[PDB]
Amino acid sequence: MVEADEMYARFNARASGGKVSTGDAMILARQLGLAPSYADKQAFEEKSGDNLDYASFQKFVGTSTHPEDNIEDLVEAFAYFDVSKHGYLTRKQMGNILMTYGEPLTTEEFNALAAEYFTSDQIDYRQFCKAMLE
């Protein structure tokens, strides 16, 4: 689990009337070091609504831990699109994957991502996935 007093501090600072929206719960979870998906958000909303007291926030953070995350599963997801098995993907290829499939990045998100974490037209997706899991 995340760091409990940080979880409490961030919730209390974001809360209004002792509650935070699931939208804010998503942000705080990320700040706490987790990677909730939008599917996690929708799943939780259908289960517990979109306005969380601290107990329900703790539970949401719980469902967002994804201990099953593994570098090999991520690396091989990108490898699938490495048609010619180069061991890298171009900016185009990375962009097309990340903005078309799954829970697609917005151009805002992708442009920020590319600025910091991309380095060329030969993105080593193994090392990129390592960085993302860090």
Partner: peptide, 30 residues
């Protein structure tokens, strides 16, 4: 069967962009 892991990659991307104020509240999945 790769899509669930693309989503995990995208979730971890968003985790690292949290201070960038760029991520939407909702995303239309594909």
């Amino acid at each position: 069967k790769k899509t669930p892991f693309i989503i995990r990659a995208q979730a971890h991307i968003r985790r690292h962009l949290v201070d960038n104020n760029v991520s939407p509240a909702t995303v239309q999945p594909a």
